[PDB]
């Protein structure tokens, strides 16, 4: 055939892939974390947006740290052979490198490790996208008038 | 072989070390902007370029309002972290 460049990911697999949305709004009283008002608006917007991009959207609400890890482990163990990519959206409280389950924090590294090139072979060479809506600390940007 | 950390893209809503803003009625600044740009450009632009538009939208169109002076009139810039090895288009 003609010249082949391979500059863009192959996105014509039978399926675009999964879009896992973890929407944590209500947290256990014991954690002292506030309810994240408005997150359902985000969850619905994401569901529709990725639906139109042809992703298999799965919305999960108020997951404990244990459920988050279990979900990610299970998802990484699925056969993604016929899928072009993987998308995971995290909506919750957070700090640098951490995302909160309803009962406590989870290291982002723990979640992403399940999808490493050597741990999820059906996604090796395919784009793995993690969209994170959560704090990464307590600094405030004062901005500058342009 | 390829790196086990290759082909990952982290679209952070805010810069390292910073708070991230969310409006209780309209949703988070970042997600609002991300969905708007994907709906408008997913069938036209490469993903990094879409995210750059998201950065500009969040950076220019949003500013916090708070009765607490400490949290008033603040800004936000999303943070694109790419370990991707190819361009990514949602269409083909």
């Amino acid at each position: 055939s003609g010249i082949s460049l391979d500059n863009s990911y192959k996105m014509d697999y039978p399926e675009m892939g999964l879009c896992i949305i973890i929407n944590n709004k209500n947290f256990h009283k014991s954690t002292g974390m506030t309810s994240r008002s408005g997150t359902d608006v985000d969850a619905a917007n994401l569901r529709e947006t990725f639906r139109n991009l042809k992703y298999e959207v799965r919305n999960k609400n108020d997951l404990t740290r244990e459920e988050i890890v279990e979900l990610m482990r299970d998802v990484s163990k699925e056969d993604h052979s016929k899928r072009s990519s993987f998308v995971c959206v995290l909506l919750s409280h957070g700090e640098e490198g951490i995302i909160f389950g309803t009962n406590g924090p989870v290291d982002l590294k723990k979640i992403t490790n399940f999808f490493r090139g050597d741990r999820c072979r059906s996604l090796t060479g395919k784009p793995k996208l993690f969209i994170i809506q959560a704090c990464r600390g307590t600094e405030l940007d004062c901005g500058i008038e342009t | 072989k390829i790196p086990v950390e290759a082909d990952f893209l982290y679209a952070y809503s805010t810069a390292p070390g910073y708070y991230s803003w969310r409006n209780s009625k309209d949703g988070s600044w970042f997600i609002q902007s991300l969905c708007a740009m994907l709906k408008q450009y997913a069938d036209k632009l490469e993903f990094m370029h879409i995210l750059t538009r998201v950065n500009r939208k969040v950076a220019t169109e949003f500013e916090s309002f708070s009765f607490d002076a400490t949290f008033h009139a603040k800004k936000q810039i999303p943070c694109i972290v790419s370990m991707l090895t190819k361009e990514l288009y949602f269409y083909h």
Partner: peptide, 4 residues
């Protein structure tokens, strides 16, 4: 506006 609130923070996460």
């Amino acid at each position: 506006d609130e923070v996460d």
